[PDB]
């Protein structure tokens, strides 16, 4: 392993909103594959269904469009129509409270899912342990 194994409580029974405390945005996967954050709780593209592929490894899927969150070879998040290696994330507890998501494919480089204060996604290489951009809270839909 390149990372710790503290896991968050909660389960995958129901869909969730992934709330980023950094700027207070919900993770959003638009129909065209664009990923970003929005503060609008009425948005129909922020409802996500997580599922466990292996303990601590998850897929994050848009319930509205069926797209999978994925991080490409240059660190950019995108919505994928089909599940692939870039769609697996290591879900971990952080600061004894938050959930963080590390790209499994790029785990050795510590590339996380993250949202900036302005609602734009962080590129993999620009994320790292210690940032507020990588901290999420799964809220009920």
Residue 55, domain CATH: 2.80.10.50
| Rounded Cα–Cα distance for residues 50 and 104 (Å) | 15
List the domain range (segments joined by +) for residue 92. Answer: 1-141
Burial of 29 (0-12, 13-18, 19+ CB in 10 A): buried
**Resolution of the experimental model, in Å, one decimal:** 1.6
SS3 for the chain is: CCCCCCCCCCCCCCCEEEEECCCCEEEEECCCCCEEEECCCCCCCCCEEEEEEECCEEEEEECCCCCEEEECCCCCEEEECCCCHHHCEEEEEECCCEEEEEECCCHHHCCECCECCCCCECCHHHCCCCCCCCCEEEEEC
Number of domains making up the chain: 1
Residues marked as binding?
22
Binding-site residue set for heparin: 22
Instruction: From 2, 1, 5, select the one nearest 109 (Cα to Cα).
Output: 2
């Amino acid at each position: 392993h390149h990372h710790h194994f503290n896991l968050p409580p909660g389960n995958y029974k129901k869909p969730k909103l992934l709330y980023c405390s950094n700027g207070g945005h919900f993770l959003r996967i638009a129909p065209n594959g664009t990923v970003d954050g929005t503060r609008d709780r009425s948005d129909q593209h922020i409802q996500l269904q997580l599922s466990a592929e292996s303990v601590g490894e998850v897929y994050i899927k848009s319930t509205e469009t069926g797209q999978y969150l994925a991080m490409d070879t240059d660190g950019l998040l995108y919505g994928s129509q089909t599940p692939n290696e870039e769609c697996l994330f290591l879900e971990r507890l952080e600061e004894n409270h938050y959930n963080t998501y590390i790209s499994k494919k790029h785990a050795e480089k510590n590339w996380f899912v993250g949202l900036k204060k302005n609602g734009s996604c962080k590129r993999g290489p620009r994320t790292h342990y210690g940032q507020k951009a990588i901290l999420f809270l799964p809220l009920p839909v």
